[PDB]
Design a protein around this ligand. Sequence first.
Ligand SMILES: C[As](C)(=O)[O-]
Ligand SMILES: C[As](C)(=O)[O-]
Lengths: 405, 404
Amino acid sequence: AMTTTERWQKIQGRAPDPIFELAKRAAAAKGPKANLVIGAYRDEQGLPYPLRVVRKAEQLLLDMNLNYEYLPISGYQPFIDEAVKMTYGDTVELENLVAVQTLSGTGALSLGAKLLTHVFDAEKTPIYLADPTWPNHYSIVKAAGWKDIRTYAYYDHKTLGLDFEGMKKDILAAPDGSVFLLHQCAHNPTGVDPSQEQWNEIASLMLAKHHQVFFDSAYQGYASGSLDTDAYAARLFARRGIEVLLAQSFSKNMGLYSERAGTLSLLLKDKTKRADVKSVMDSLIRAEYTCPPAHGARLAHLILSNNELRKEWEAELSAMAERIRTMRRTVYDELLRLQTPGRWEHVINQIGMFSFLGLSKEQCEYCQNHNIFITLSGRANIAGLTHETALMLAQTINDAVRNVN
Amino acid sequence: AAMTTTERWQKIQGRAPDPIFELAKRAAAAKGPKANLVIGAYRDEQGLPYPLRVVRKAEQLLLDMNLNYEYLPISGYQPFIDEAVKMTYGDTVELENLVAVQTLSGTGALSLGAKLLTHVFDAEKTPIYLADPTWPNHYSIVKAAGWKDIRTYAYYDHKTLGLDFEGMKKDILAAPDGSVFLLHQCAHNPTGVDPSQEQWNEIASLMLAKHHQVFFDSAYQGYASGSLDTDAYAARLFARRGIEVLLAQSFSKNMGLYSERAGTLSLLLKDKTKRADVKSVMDSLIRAEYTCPPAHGARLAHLILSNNELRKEWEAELSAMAERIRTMRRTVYDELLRLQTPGRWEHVINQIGMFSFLGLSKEQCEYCQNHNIFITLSGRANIAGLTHETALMLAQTINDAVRN
Ligand SMILES: C[As](C)(=O)[O-]
Ligand SMILES: C[As](C)(=O)[O-]
């Protein structure tokens, strides 16, 4: 603390991201293995799967010779409009909402959490996250300045299902005018979503308590294989009059992980305030990164907008969702043939890319040590499996259960 | 007292608009003959957006590589980082003794760097010094990163239209030891005024004696003079003088990659264990903001930096862009001489890079704007948006503004 060298010498290091680390360990791991850490889709051969429609869009886009001039702060409008239309339906009135392009879902979550501090007192108003949830959610929200982060009950670790009664109690027990970060479909990590009727009950509670709803929509398409089906909760909440804030990602459903394409949108009840909310969002973006990367949004716009590419895309995503169910069925069937102790129906009843297996930290540690790389919380990327490794996963679960529990 | 969400959203405070934004909009919508010289992007000799030929080549090469779209590491695409830092510092002892990450271009590196520095300095008490004048977004970025005592150092001499080097030195010395100084590495924005080599060396010495932290904004290497070496002088000199340089790098102007957002943040730091701690803070800050950076811009810049043939093509293509800006500076100058406009006008050809402080009063800049010559009220013009034709128009309108 006199020369700059001395000043830097005192910088406090930070722990590394456990997920991204484990994925690195898995990727380095030796013989036959299952790298099931990160939620990234793999094909039948277990290899990365750039979508055929994205390969088509690459060539279309290159032939068009668009320029590289700065986007507006808010980003590439053709993409934003199509993207909001994909989640809210061709019905949606673009004029009654505010929406910007973001750095995928993470970017929309960070941006939205910061925005909310201009409307709510982030020193006092709680923000509620699901129990359990993406551990990065807590980090993002905290970094954005939220000082009272809480949990709503969601998953029942005994029944390996939804704890809906606990969720309702926690919504009602929260102070009025709190923020709730909800998973729009394919809850991460549990893979269990409310029913349609349960979503409508949640909406009525959010209304009666004057809560702010923040949807995280990272997996639209993966809960059912159908984009329209999976948009049910967002569309319901819109129809019910909720001022929905929603963070959207194209990393998983279009496979654009590396290009960072997403949106942040707000259904603003008072149209005269749209300009003011846009001006805050734009100042937040301007002071971080000035404007977003164009390539991913340009690619996604072509795929959303063109009727042929859009239908090809939806068929490709439907097939992706179906390979995941086949993998679930393969693991489940093998768990039955080995007569592994316990119930395993949640492997096939859960939806999305993951299975939340319900194993102990020690059983998970066992798995990792036999080259089955699932998280310590028991989360497994089913979309990482091949027929070979789905069988290995079951065999290792069977071993872990019979030998540690 | 707001109760419903709609009532809370009702109370949100709109954030005042960028006056440059409003002017640029006026300029872009204007009919009739005009010169839109507001926003800082390169235009070619026909006044048009200029995708680089080497970037169009690299696009096709990348497509033919059949690459996937899987996440980059949090810190970004490491071959890009390595080539990017080798470009600014050269193939030298530095490359092993630094920490660097990919960022969302210069802006991203500036925000990340300003946040990072709050983990080494007390942003509540330690002053951070910006140039007088500077890019208005500098103030926004630092304020938003948490800096509470934002100050300025004398830089442009509004009388001489050159550098106020004595005043700069005085402010460097008068600041408390251990302050942060955000320096423009080359092509100062908005003025085009840069210190000489010998002046940069005096500055390095002052920074060492005062134990100031140096934060370089490096948005224009190569693009300023046409030479990557020339334009890297300050960074390399400061490195050689032993300064722990924090540096924000952009490929927006020098590769025309405005839309793809490719940049780096790097720190020169000797101890290897501490390099890894610094890294861990950079990665933590990234992760909570956007998880990892976009790949397409980084893959384009890496291929151009690394492919020996594209690298050579690019340096020639950049040299020609820089030359064309000088050419426009020369055209304006000659016309102002030709028209015998009152006053000194040599600053038009002594300034370097895209931007020029023309030296006009507010009333004269208003006159330019009302005659469809869109420069800012502080007299900033983007020389690089001129054509031979609008260069002459500018000089003639300046000559009218000055005369009435
Ligand atoms: C983790 As994401 C939705 O920012 O690719
Ligand atoms: C203005 As920039 C250096 O972030 O493209």
